[PDB]
Every structure is written in structure tokens, then in C-alpha cells.
Amino acid sequence: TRTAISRREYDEWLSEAASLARALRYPVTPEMVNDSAGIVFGDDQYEAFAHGLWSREPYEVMVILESLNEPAVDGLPAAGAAHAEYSGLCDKLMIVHPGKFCPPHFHQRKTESYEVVLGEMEVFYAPEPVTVGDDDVLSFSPMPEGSPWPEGVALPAGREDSYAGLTSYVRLRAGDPKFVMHRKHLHAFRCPADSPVPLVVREVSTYSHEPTEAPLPQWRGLHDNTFVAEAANSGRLATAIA
Amino acid sequence: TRTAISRREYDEWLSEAASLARALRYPVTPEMVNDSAGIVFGDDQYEAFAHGLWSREPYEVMVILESLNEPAVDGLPAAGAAHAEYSGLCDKLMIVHPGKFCPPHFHQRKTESYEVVLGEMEVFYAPEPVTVGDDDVLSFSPMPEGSPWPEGVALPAGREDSYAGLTSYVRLRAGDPKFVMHRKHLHAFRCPADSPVPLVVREVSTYSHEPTEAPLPQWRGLHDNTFVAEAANSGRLATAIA
Amino acid sequence: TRTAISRREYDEWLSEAASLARALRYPVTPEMVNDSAGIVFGDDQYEAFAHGLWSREPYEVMVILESLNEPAVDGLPAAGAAHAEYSGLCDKLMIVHPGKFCPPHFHQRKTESYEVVLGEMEVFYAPEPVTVGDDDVLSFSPMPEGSPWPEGVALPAGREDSYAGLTSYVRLRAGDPKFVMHRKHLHAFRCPADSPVPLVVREVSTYSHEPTEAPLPQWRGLHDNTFVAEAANSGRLATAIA
Amino acid sequence: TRTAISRREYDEWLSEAASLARALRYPVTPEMVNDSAGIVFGDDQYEAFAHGLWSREPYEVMVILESLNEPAVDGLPAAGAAHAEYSGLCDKLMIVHPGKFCPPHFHQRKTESYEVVLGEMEVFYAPEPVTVGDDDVLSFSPMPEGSPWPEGVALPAGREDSYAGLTSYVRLRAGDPKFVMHRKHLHAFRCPADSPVPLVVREVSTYSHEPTEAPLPQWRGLHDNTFVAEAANSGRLATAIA
Ligand SMILES: O=C[C@@H](O)[C@@H](O)[C@@H](O)CO
Ligand SMILES: O=C[C@@H](O)[C@@H](O)[C@@H](O)CO
Ligand SMILES: O[C@@H]1[C@H](O)[C@@H](O)OC[C@@H]1O
Ligand SMILES: O[C@@H]1[C@H](O)[C@@H](O)OC[C@@H]1O
Ligand SMILES: O[C@@H]1[C@H](O)[C@@H](O)OC[C@@H]1O
Ligand SMILES: O[C@@H]1[C@H](O)[C@@H](O)OC[C@@H]1O
Ligand SMILES: O[C@@H]1[C@H](O)[C@@H](O)OC[C@@H]1O
Ligand SMILES: O[C@@H]1[C@H](O)[C@@H](O)OC[C@@H]1O
Ligand SMILES: [Mn+2]
Ligand SMILES: [Mn+2]
Ligand SMILES: [Mn+2]
Ligand SMILES: [Mn+2]
To answer: How far is the CA of B85 from the centre of ligand 9 (A)?
Structure first.
């Protein structure tokens, strides 16, 4: 069974992704195309390359090209240092092939928004937030109810139940209003298995805390991604390339 | 002297801007194309329409198509409500015609980033931040020094003095990495007068406090745009459309 | 009544057209943006500027940006000189605002194809060709039957009957197969009056004979455009700019 | 040595090419993505897939997405049937990966033009045309002289001699005007080996006589592509897909 992605498969994967990105005018510089841009959520997901990104089979694998991840700490009153981690600015372009997913997870600090550029994006999420740390939190524009799931959605083998809690559904297309995914909400999304093209979506969010193999001292070693499936909560880290 | 823009001049201005935006794949919704999107920074700037947006003359007027201005207050610990106004997520496409400017100003709370989509962007700014209050302010990655202004830049008549403090200069082009403009920094920008196309720039910043059309009680009536020129300061809002 | 287009209206018209073109990646160089690119079919059509290109009123006015018009005579056996005028290569980008048309006409020599890039294009045409010169002509892929006209089409005032002979209709969208309009077929097209954006279509055709204010001697002074409305068959020539 | 391409390698190749094409707004229909679109010029060129399309190695292989190949025979006077094969309209998007080439060859009948959409195109050609027959041939605007080849160009092993006659060189970039390649001129082109993206070029030419999948009886079985290298000449058609 696949336990890693060959160097050829990885380079072709990231090279076509970055080319598609540039074609769509996304600002891609060389340092953005690296060994951690092509993510495989869990070792059992390397099997996605047994048949390839165009097999239309359900797997949690994607490429992320990050053009910005600004802490936005400069100029902030020291008084706000404690919650500065809930702010910041991040701009990423995400490429998901037909039938593949960004697995169920949530962020304690990061609030994000989606802009579909190419293809269509099916988002699965939980309208009710979880509570992390202090129970006292602000509220303004609670997550919408969306719709129930459509029929025929193929979920990854052995990961089906990690989607049980993401009962709301919304299908996003290019040109639709920006979709906001508030922090502390379980969410996931896939590119329709029958899509003629890879899904390309721009994510604009607050700072993305993802320890790489510090704006403020309390930001060091901060992990802001909590995955439902324990198996994927691990792989998100590094990519096994052979 | 022009004291307003005609309905025809306005509708054509906004219609061509929205078309250009859609062509570049920016998500424009009908609600984004409104009578507040075409901005004229001061009553003496309505004169820009005496000769038109292709006269290549120096005036402070522009179009802003805002696709997102998310408070990002939901899920934020109440303990951080006092500095929430420094966060949030704003996504807008700015369209500036040849020779025109986004007037000198700074934001106490908003930190922005620029992504040139079409044409080129000449940015003028103060490398040193203005001191709003005095209390401890955080630091991490101060504004780069930049370069001196090139020769040839024509400033708006009567407003040239307001650009005196913006000694640093940088020319951004499509494909360049993201350029960050930290809060409390005086800045302005223009589309080169010789440009064959309007400057089209995607701005991703923190929340934009601009009563144009409340997430938190404190945010009510808050204005986070302070312009160097008084003329553009006060009479900056509502656009006079005849 | 309008008998010409002001210099401001023309420059704004062509400048936005060329910017939209470049945004769509069409190869536009300065010599392409000239005094003959913005066409007004007949002096009675200058009235289109009384209310402007965004009034959605029916008029026969459009901009044509020609990037190629290659005779393709080089290398051709001298034996084919006689019909060389039916060959050649022409590449043009056409921009038609909401509700405006490219008027009923036909070409004796030019065969063309359409590729909608932005917006939608409604083509009105005659499936049966006319005979010009010798009656003996080749046949292979006769023009399709298309569909009858949809309801609600607003035709230009005083030009309604020039559309009587173009009974077939087809609506083209971005991504559809190339639509071929064989030579000697009456045709016209408009941008839906309710369109949010100007129609942008790429035309790939054989050489475009349009005497400007010679590959082969018999090509000198060749006029290959025959308009139904005599009033437009004249204006096609030059553009009255004041 | 590789003697064919696997179904997976082929489907990924064509799928990513079609996606990139659609991203750039080229009109791709399902029928355009077929088993004849991925071209391998000679059995010894299948070795390009030993290391892949991103190995940046010199091989003669490419993808052609043909949206149009119109005879333009309809309405053509019978008197010009003998030279109809030199006319017609062909529109195709060519996708060439870093380091790869469109092998040396000339067309007796087809005249082409290039429009670079993404990346850069290095064209190698003979400024003087080859003399097919001898009969009078027409002239109007002979091929420009061009410049000498730059240093660094790696040619395909075993085919380097076939490029000896293509002494002229020109580097085309997106936004450049159309570049015409008159018929009877030997030519070849490649995507620079250091390119971060595949070369994407729109070709507009006269009819392409290439029995891949009759407008005139004479056109039956006609092949208008003559390659310098015999290897690529004969075994150029059908792609061996395992
Ligand atoms: O760069 C300028 C941005 O902050 C703009 O959205 C505001 O200044 C509006 O004038
Ligand atoms: O430049 C090359 C073009 O003629 C191509 O469409 C053919 O040569 C196919 O090999
Ligand atoms: O994934 C492979 C290929 O890319 C697809 O087209 O068919 C199935 C095969 O396993
Ligand atoms: O941060 C990455 C992505 O930007 C987000 O949408 O989902 C989690 C993933 O690790
Ligand atoms: O005064 C302006 C600016 O502040 C200075 O740095 O360069 C000249 C310009 O006019
Ligand atoms: O054409 C003018 C304007 O551009 C449009 O929006 O409304 C009608 C007016 O006459
Ligand atoms: O040649 C122009 C255009 O390219 C064609 O489609 O219609 C006639 C007009 O004059
Ligand atoms: O032989 C090739 C070409 O014909 C010549 O002009 O430059 C060197 C190259 O290898
Ligand atoms: Mn997420
Ligand atoms: Mn600002
Ligand atoms: Mn025509
Ligand atoms: Mn060729």
C-alpha cells in the first residue's frame, strides 16, 4: 500500500497546480511551491496516488498555495496582544481535484472565507460552534443553516463517520457572494467527483497558525487545526515524498 | 467647476469597472455595484469628471468593489472585544484610472495588503508610522524603506502638500508578491498617467470601518480613515450624483 | 441630433474596450486603438451616444480590435492568385454593449467564426446563401437551421425591416463550440439588452477586405461588406469624431 | 525504452491541459479532449514519459486542443477548388511543457500565426522558404530575418541534426503581436526548459490537413505536415496508449 508519493507524482501535482494558479492570475513565487504545499491528510490517504488525481475516487488530498500570512501585529496596541492570534491576514489558493476533500476539522482562532475561482465547491459544515477555552464569546452573524446534503456524495473509505457532524451543505460557484466560515465551526469541502476541472478556490482568512518542521511569544508552536479523524490530524503536518 | 457627477457618467463608470472586474474573475454581485462604490475624495475632486476618467489628469477618485467586510467577531472571546476593531476580513477590488489617486491617509486600525491584477501600482508612503496615542504599540516587521520617488509624478492641484510625508515609493506589478501596508502608516497610490489600462488591485485587509451604507456597540459610528487633506477628509463619503 | 461622437466619448469608449480586451488577454498594441476601431453604422446611429453605451437602447455601434489580417499570399502557387482573396487570416476581438448590434450584412469572400469570450451573443442569420459573381460554387457544410427568434428582441429604430431576411437564430455563450458563418450569408448579432456586461467575441475569419481612408493587384479597393440597410452600408467607412 | 504512454499518464496529461485551457478561457468541448490530442512525434519520443512532462528534458511531444478546422469551401467558386486546400480556418490551443518541442517541419499549404497566452515561446525557423515544386509562387511579405539562437537550448537526443536548417530565432511572449509563419517555411518551437508553466499558445492558421480522426475529393487522404526527421514523420499519427 502507498505510504508516500513519488518525487515525480509530487512535482507533477504541484507544478500543474501552480501553473493553473498562475493562469488564473494568482501571485505565485517560487518559495510558495515547496515540499509542504501538497497535503495528504493521513498515511492512509497516500493511496489517492495509486490511481491518481484524475481517478475521481474520494480521498482527502489537496494543494495549498499561500501568498500571504501576515500577523498584523505591527501597530496593534499592546493591550490586544492576548487576542492578536485571532486576527492577522492570510491569502491562499486551494486546488482540489475531482472527488477529493479537505477533511472535517475546525479552527479555534481562524475565521475564513471562500471565493470559488474555477469549478464548484461543496461545503459540509456544522452551523453550531464548539466552545474552546473560555465560554464567553461574542456573536453577530451566526453561521447560516444552508441545506441538507444532496444525494450521491462519495466519502473517503474509513473516514465516513468523521463527516457525521457536518450536516449543513452549500454548493458554491464562481461569482457567488463570499462564503464565511466562522472560527470554531466544523467544516469540510470537496470538488464534485464529476467535475471536468480541479476546484480552485481563494481563501481569505485571519492568520494561519501551522507549525512548520514568532510574531508574539504566545504564538510559538501554536496549532490551530483540529481534525475530526485522528488519522488526518497527524498527516496534515509533513508530506512523505519518495 | 463640477460639483457632482451625472447619473450617466456614474453608471458608465461603475458599469465598465464591474465589467472589467468580472472579466478578471472578481466576484461581483449586483449589490456591490451601488451609488457609494464610485468615490470622489472631496468636492474639488468632482472636477475629474469635467474631462473624464481617461484625461490622464491628476485627481483623487476611484471605484471600490467590496466583496467582503467580515467583522470576524463571532467566536471571538469577549475578553478581546476591545481590540476586535483591529481585526476582521475585508476583500475589495480597487479600480483607479490613469493618473488618478487614492489620496494620502492612514488607518489607526486597518492593516492592508495589495495584489495588482492589471496594470501597475505606484505606492507612496511614510516608512515610519504615525503615533496615534502613545501607549505601548507592538512591532514585528516594520515597513521596508522602499525607494525615492521617480521623476514625472503629477499630483492633484491643491493637494500636492498632502503628499509631502509619503517619502517612500514602490512600484507594484501583476505577479509580484503581496505588499503589506501596516496600520498607522500614511499612504497613497496611483495608476501611472501613461498606463493603457486602469489599475486593478485586489486589497485584502482587516475590517473596513467606513460608514458607507453593528457587529459590536463600540464599532457604531466608527471611522477608521483619516486623510491628510481636510478637503478630502470631511466631504469624502456620499457621492454627489446628479 | 447627434451627427458625430465627441473626442471624450470616443476615447472613453475605445479605452475601456481595449482595457477589457487586455484583461481578457487579447493581444492589443497601440496601433490597434485608432480612429476607425469604434464603428457607427450610419449617421443616424450616432444617436446611440445621446444616452450612451449603457442605455441598453438598440443601435448599430461596436468596437473592433483587429490583431491580424494576413493575406496568406506568400508561398501560394500563382495559379491560385484569382481566388486568394477568399483566403487569408483575420483575428479580431469585437465588443458590443448591451442591446447594440452589428447590422445585417454579408460578405462575398469572407467566411468567419465566432468565439464568445464574455457575455452572450445573439446571432440572426439567413441559412440560404446568395449568389455573387459566378453561380458555380462549392458546397460542403451548409449553414444550420438554428431556431426561430425568441420574443422581446428590440431592433434599431428605422432599421427593423433590414432584419426581415435573417430568420434563423442562435444564442452563443462562452465555452460553446465555434460557430461558423459561411461567406454569402446574411447575418447580424447583438448583445442582449439585459446583459450585465458588454459582449466580447473573438472572430477568426479569412482576410478582411475593408478599404482604409496591396497583396495582389486585384485586391486594391476591394469592398467585401454588403449591408442591407443602405444607411449603414455607408457609415461603416469612417467615424465622425468631434 | 518506453514504447507507449499509460492510460493514466495520458488522461492526466490531457485533463490538466484541458483544465489549464479552460482556465485561460479557451473553448474546450468534450470532443476536443480525445486520444489523438496528446501527440508523440515518433516512437523514440515516448521516452518523454519515462521521467514525465515536468522533467524539463528535451523531447518532441505536445497537446493540441483543436476548436476549429473549417474548410471554408462553402460558397467558394468552383474555379478556385484547386487552391482551396491552401485556405480554410484552423483554431487550436497548443500546450507544450518545459523543455519540450513541436518538431522541425514545414507545410506546403498551411500558413499559421502564433499568439502566446501563457509562458514564453522560442521559435526556430528557416527565413528562406523551401521550394516545393518550382512553378511560380507568390510573394508579399517574406519572413523576417529574426535573430541567432541564444545559448542554452537543449535539443532532443537523436534529432539535433533536424534543427540545423532552422537558423532564425524569435522569442514570443504574451501580449506580443501576432507572429506569422508562412507556408513552406521550416519551423519548430519549444517551451524554455526553465519555464515555471507549460507554454500555452493559440494558433490561428489555414486548414489543417492531418488525417487524425471529405470537404473536397482532392482533400481526401491529404497530409500537409512534412517533418525533417523521418522518425517523427511516419510514426507521428496515432498515439500509443496502453
Ligand atoms: O488604500 C486605501 C483603502 O484603505 C481604501 O479602501 C480606503 O482608504 C477607502 O478610501
Ligand atoms: O506548428 C505546428 C502546427 O502546424 C501543428 O498544428 C502541426 O504541426 C501538428 O504537428
Ligand atoms: O485513475 C486512472 C486514470 O487516470 C483514470 O482516467 O481512469 C482510472 C485509472 O485508474
Ligand atoms: O489550513 C488549511 C486550509 O487553508 C483550511 O481551509 O483547512 C485546513 C487546512 O489545513
Ligand atoms: O514631496 C513629495 C514626496 O514627499 C517627496 O519624497 O518626493 C517629492 C514629492 O513631491
Ligand atoms: O443612458 C443613461 C444612463 O447611462 C443609464 O443608466 O440610464 C439612462 C440614461 O439615459
Ligand atoms: O468586418 C466587421 C466584422 O468583423 C464583421 O463580423 O461584420 C462586419 C464588420 O464590418
Ligand atoms: O544547428 C542549430 C541551428 O541551425 C543553428 O542556427 O544554431 C545552432 C543550433 O544548434
Ligand atoms: Mn479550515
Ligand atoms: Mn488605506
Ligand atoms: Mn460579418
Ligand atoms: Mn506547423
So the answer is: 23
Q: DSSP states of A133-158 as a string?
A: S-S-B--SSPPP--BPPPTTPPPPTT
Which technique? X-ray
Q: Is B66 helix (H, G, I), strand (E, B) or coil?
A: strand
**B181 pairs with which residues across the strands?**
B112
Which residue, chain included where needed, has cell 469624502?
B236
**Neighbouring-strand partners of residue A189:** A102, A123
Q: Exposure of C201 by Cβ count < 10 A (0-12 exposed, 13-18 middle, 19+ buried)?
A: buried
Any ligand 7 atom below 6 A from CB of C97 = no
What b/e string do you get for A48-86 counting C-beta neighbours within 10 Å, with b at 16 or more? bbeebbbbbbbbbbbbbbbbbbbbbbbbbbeebbebbbb
**Whole-angstrom distance, CA of residue D115 vs CA of residue D93:** 9
Q: Which of B96, B95, B40 is nearest to B65 (CA)?
A: B95
Residue D107 is labelled as binding a ligand: yes
C-alpha pair distances (Å), C241 with each of C8, C31, C36: 9, 18, 10
Dihedral angle of Cα C91, D34, D210, D80, to the nearest 10 degrees: -50
Q: What are phi and psi of A234, to 5 degrees?
A: -100, -55
At how many Å resolution was this determined?
A: 2.0
Task: Count CB-CB contacts under 10 A for residue C220.
Answer: 10
Domains, chain B? 1-242 (2.60.120.10)
Give the chain C residue nearest D139 (alpha carbons). Answer: C74
Report the distance separating Cα A226 and Cα A236, nearest Å: 10
Residues on chain B touching A74 (C-beta within 8 angstroms): 111, 129, 138-142, 182-183
Q: Which residues of B touch A143 (CB under 8 A)?
A: 74
List of chains touching B (3+ CB pairs within 8 A): A, C
Residue from D101, D122, D123, D124 to probe ligand 8 pocket by mutation (most atoms less than 8 Å from CB): D124
Residues of C within the annotated binding site for Mn(2+)? 105, 107, 112, 187
Residue A48 near residue A240, CB atoms below 8 Å: no
3-state secondary structure of C196: coil
Report how far residue D83's alpha carbon sits from residue A223's, in angstroms, rounded to the nearest whole number: 71
CA max distance for chain A:
53
The Cα–Cα gap between B103 and B100 comes to 9
